[PDB]
Amino acid sequence: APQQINDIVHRTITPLIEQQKIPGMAVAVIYQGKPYYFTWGYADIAKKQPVTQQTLFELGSVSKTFTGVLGGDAIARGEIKLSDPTTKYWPELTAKQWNGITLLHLATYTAGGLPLQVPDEVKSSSDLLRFYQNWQPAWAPGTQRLYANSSIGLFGALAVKPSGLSFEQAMQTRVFQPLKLNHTWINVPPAEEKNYAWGYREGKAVHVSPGALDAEAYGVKSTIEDMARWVQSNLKPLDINEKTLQQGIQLAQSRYWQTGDMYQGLGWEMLDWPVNPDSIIALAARPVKAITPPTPAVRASWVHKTGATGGFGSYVAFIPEKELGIVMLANKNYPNPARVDAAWQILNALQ
Ligand SMILES: *[B]([O])([O])[C][N]S(=O)(=O)[C]C1=[C][C]=C(C([O])=O)[C]=[C]1
Numbered sequence: 001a002p003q004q005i006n007d008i009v010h011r012t013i014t015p016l017i018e019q020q021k022i023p024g025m026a027v028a029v030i031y032q033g034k035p036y037y038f039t040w041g042y043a044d045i046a047k048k049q050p051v052t053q054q055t056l057f058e059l060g061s062v063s064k065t066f067t068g069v070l071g072g073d074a075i076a077r078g079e080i081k082l083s084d085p086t087t088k089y090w091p092e093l094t095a096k097q098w099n100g101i102t103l104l105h106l107a108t109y110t111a112g113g114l115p116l117q118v119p120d121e122v123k124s125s126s127d128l129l130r131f132y133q134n135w136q137p138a139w140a141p142g143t144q145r146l147y148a149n150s151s152i153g154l155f156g157a158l159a160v161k162p163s164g165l166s167f168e169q170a171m172q173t174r175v176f177q178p179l180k181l182n183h184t185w186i187n188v189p190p191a192e193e194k195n196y197a198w199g200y201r202e203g204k205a206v207h208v209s210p211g212a213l214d215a216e217a218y219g220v221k222s223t224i225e226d227m228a229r230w231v232q233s234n235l236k237p238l239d240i241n242e243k244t245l246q247q248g249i250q251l252a253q254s255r256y257w258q259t260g261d262m263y264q265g266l267g268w269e270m271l272d273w274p275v276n277p278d279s280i281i282a283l284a285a286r287p288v289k290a291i292t293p294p295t296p297a298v299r300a301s302w303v304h305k306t307g308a309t310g311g312f313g314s315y316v317a318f319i320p321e322k323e324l325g326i327v328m329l330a331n332k333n334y335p336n337p338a339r340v341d342a343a344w345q346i347l348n349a350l351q
Contacts, residue, residue, distance in 0.1 A: 001036045005029055008349040009038050012342050013328075017041065020334040022313075023200050024051040028228035030235065030318065030325040031350055035228035043197035043331065046205065056188060056196045056221045057329040058208050060307030061149075062314045063220035065230075065252070067156040068267025070175050071107060072248030079162035082107065089158040095133045105141045106155035108256050108264045110288055112137030113144070114151040118212040128212055138285075145259055145288045149217035152267070156216030167215050178242050179233050184222040186215045196221065197331045199311015206311040218309060224329055231318050231325040234268075234303070253297035253320075257288040263295075264288070270301040273319050277337075277344040280304070304343075308333045315339040322351050 001009075009027060017025055017040055024041035039051040074080045080089070082104035087093050089103075097112075105111040114135065122131050132154065138144075160170040168186045176184050188196050198205035208219065222230070233240060237249040255263035255270060261279045263270045271280060280302065297320070304317035313333040317340075318325030326343050 002031070005031055005036050005350065008346050009036075012345045013038065013040065016338060016342050020330075020332065020338060022330045022332045022334060024055070024197060025328065025330040026051050026053070026055060026057065026224035027329070028224045028231070028327040029346065029350070030228060030231050030323070033232065033235065033323045035225070035232070037224055037228070039224070043195075044205070045198070045200070051197065052195075053225050054183065054195050054223050056183070056185070056192060056223055057314060057331060058199060058309040058312040059220045059222055059227075059314050059329075060208075060218050060309040060312055062227075062305050062307035062316055063216075063218050064152050064307075065234075065267035065305050065316070066171060066175060066220055067152060067216050068107065068252040068265065069234075069245075069248050070171055071103075071155060071159040071266055072251035073174050073244050074159045074163065074248070075251055076244035076247035080159050086154070086158065089161050090129075092129055093132060097135070097137050098132075101141045103155055103158065104256065106151050106158070107266050109145045109148050109151045110142050110257060110264075111151055112139040112141050113146050113285070114148045114154075116146070116148050116150070116283060118150045118153065120211065122212045131212075142290060143287065144285050145257060145264060146283065146285050149213060153213030153217035157213060171215075174245065178240070178245050179229060181222070181226045181229060184220060184226045184230075186219050186221075188221050195223070197312075199309060199331045199333070201311045201333065208309045208311075218307070222329075224327060227316065227327040227329065231316060231327055235318050235320055235323055235325055237297075250297050253301075253303060255291050255295040255298065258291060259286040259288050263291070263301075265303070268303050268305060270298065270303045272298070273300045273302050273321060275302055277340050280340050280344065304340075306336050306339060313339065315343055317343050317347065319347065319351065324351055
């Protein structure tokens with residue numbers, strides 16, 4: 001690593017780990033389009049297994065970037081349109097509240113107040129149908145944003161329906177494989193368990209538990225190397241050989257809605273670059289303004305996503321205009337503001 005990167009990263013992350021009591025962490029900085037890796041601490045405290053560049057972390061909601069891109073790829077393929085009604089892909093969804101709710105609304109949390117969490121009791125396909133049928137919107141579609149697993153999760157399941165493929169199969173074949181993300185999993189195979197970090201919550205080792213729409217909303221596990229490659233792909237979509245995937249990436253970074261200083265993409269969220277971290281709560285309802293039509297991906301943006309599971313905390317942010325990015329993977333769920341502060345400190349220094 002160039003000394004500048006080594007220094008800013010270590011001097012920022014070391015105190016972070018100490019203040020937040022993070023067991024293990026991996027960080028990748030993409031600087032002029034080249035990745036640099038850093039690791040600290042334990043993937044498994046009990047077995048004294050260190051974090052390495054091959055350690056798997058639960059990405060939590062950073063998984064939504066993959067879902068948003070897979071969706072974009074499906075649009076590019078002509079398999080779905082975001083202007084399509086949800087019922088086009090789920091005709092059993094007959095309750096009248098669903099009239100006027102489009103795939104766009106699902107993808108961007110603007111359907112009218114879909115719940116943050118799918119209830120635990122919701123297991124089967126029939127359970128899900130009943131859940132969405134019984135749901136009562138607080139608001140008309142496209143008037144407020146409420147971040148929600150049950151929103152983008154449904155979008156993910158529906159977007160792959162035309163493909164004929166299972167969600168995991170579509171993600172594997174259309175996103176992971178093309179991008180050479182060969183150590184990124186919705187389901188961690190036994191051959192890779194040796195690398196799967198434990199999450200820590202209240203000092204107990206924990207992995208994410210199965211749930212409806214988990215794959216779609218929060219279920220991806222990945223290494224720091226793969227996430228660095230994910231950032232590279234999103235920084236420069238044009239280098240991507242597969243046409244629809246290149247387009248899907250671009251679509252995921254389009255600006256569909258504005259709330260305050262932030263713009264909603266598919267999975268990704270964006271703010272105009274430059275900006276201070278200050279500009280960058282269980283339930284937070286905000287009115288949205290439609291961007292009509294959506295603005296194509298803006299190079300001078302801070303594009304980011306935070307993610308958490310019970311035992312993991314992740315963050316990704318990049319700035320296309322400066323070919324610069326960062327991935328922070330930790331096996332403790334620590335406060336978002338601390339993640340954003342650290343990322344900003346590192347990227348600001350290098351930009
Ligand atoms: B995202 O990281 O913003 C989604 N947040 S969340 O609360 O759904 C994360 C999550 C998912 C599963 C579990 C579990 O199985 O205990 C915990 C937290």
